Amino acid sequence: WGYGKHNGPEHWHKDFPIAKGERQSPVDIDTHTAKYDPSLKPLSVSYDQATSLRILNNGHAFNVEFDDSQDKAVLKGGPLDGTYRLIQFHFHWGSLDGQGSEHTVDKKKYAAELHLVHWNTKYGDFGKAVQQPDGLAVLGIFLKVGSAKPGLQKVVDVLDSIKTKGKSADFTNFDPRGLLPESLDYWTYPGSETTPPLLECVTWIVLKEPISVSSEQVLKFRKLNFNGEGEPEELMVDNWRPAQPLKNRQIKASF
Ligand SMILES: CC(=O)Nc1nnc(S(N)(=O)=O)s1
Numbered sequence: 182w183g184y185g186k187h188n189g190p191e192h193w194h195k196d197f198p199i200a201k202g203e204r205q206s207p208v209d210i211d212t213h214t215a216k217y218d219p220s221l222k223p224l225s226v227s228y229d230q231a232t233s234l235r236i237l238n239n240g241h242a243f244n245v246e247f248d249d250s251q252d253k254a255v256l257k258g259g260p261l262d263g264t265y266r267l268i269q270f271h272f273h274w275g276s277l278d279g280q281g282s283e284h285t286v287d288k289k290k291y292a293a294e295l296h297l298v299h300w301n302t303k304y305g306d307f308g309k310a311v312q313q314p315d316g317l318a319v320l321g322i323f324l325k326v327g328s329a330k331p332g333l334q335k336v337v338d339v340l341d342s343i344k345t346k347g348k349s350a351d352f353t354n355f356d357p358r359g360l361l362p363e364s365l366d367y368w369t370y371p372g373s374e375t376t377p378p379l380l381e382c383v384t385w386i387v388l389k390e391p392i393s394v395s396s397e398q399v400l401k402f403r404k405l406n407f408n409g410e411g412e413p414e415e416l417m418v419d420n421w422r423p424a425q426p427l428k429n430r431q432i433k434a435s436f
């Protein structure tokens with residue numbers, strides 16, 4: 182599976198038939214059919230005791246991994262019942278600045294999208310959590326191209342260390358708070374992981390307020406490679422899944 186002509190999203194259904202299931206992500210957020218629900222609590226993002234461990238290029242994107250052995254960085258509040266542990270975060274980006282996001286907002290596509298993944302602590306570990314309809318919660322953040330994001334620069338600089346598939350680099354003392362927008366106003370809906378196994382286990386929480394990063398900061402994203410070392414060069418660009426049919430679902434807004 183990958184994002185190419187022969188192994189791209191329009192083919193993942195053959196090994197992963199859940200690709201055309203019931204609650205698949207991403208989706209277009211139509212802001213006028215989004216149901217403002219005033220029973221939706223504010224988000225409680227507690228990320229001040231976060232331990233980042235490392236960064237690694239896994240062939241389809243890079244993941245800053247975190248130590249989820251204790252509630253150090255947790256997400257609760259909003260639509261969530263219970264505490265969800267931060268395990269890792271990654272982006273999806275495009276080859277140009279008019280594509281990149283997975284989720285769109287009135288069919289508009291932004292330059293990229295940050296996903297901070299969290300698993301429900303009721304289930305003991307991430308592994309058991311994806312056996313559950315409420316196992317995961319992914320906080321989604323849109324990136325637009327403008328002024329540079331200060332807090333994004335440590336990530337951008339490490340990317341030469343992990344140019345190719347399989348590479349890693351110790352990456353401690355990274356504080357994820359530096360990537361959060363000013364406002365925690367979100368849209369939320371039942372969905373899925375957007376990369377195989379496409380498990381229908383995610384409560385998505387997409388923020389309304391994009392962060393901006395600079396054009397030179399996102400250029401560095403597009404230098405990475407899909408391919409392993411000593412293999413033909415495949416630039417890691419456009420690693421996003423097209424929007425899926427909302428099928429029944431209604432998207433709520435906290436605003
Ligand atoms: C281990 C892990 O995190 N797997 C994920 N699969 N898809 C994710 S995504 N596309 O929803 O943000 S996270």
Ligand SMILES: [Hg+2]
Pocket residue numbers: 310311312313314315316380381382
């Ligand atoms: Hg599930």
Ligand SMILES: [Zn+2]
Pocket residue numbers: 271272273296375
């Ligand atoms: Zn993702």
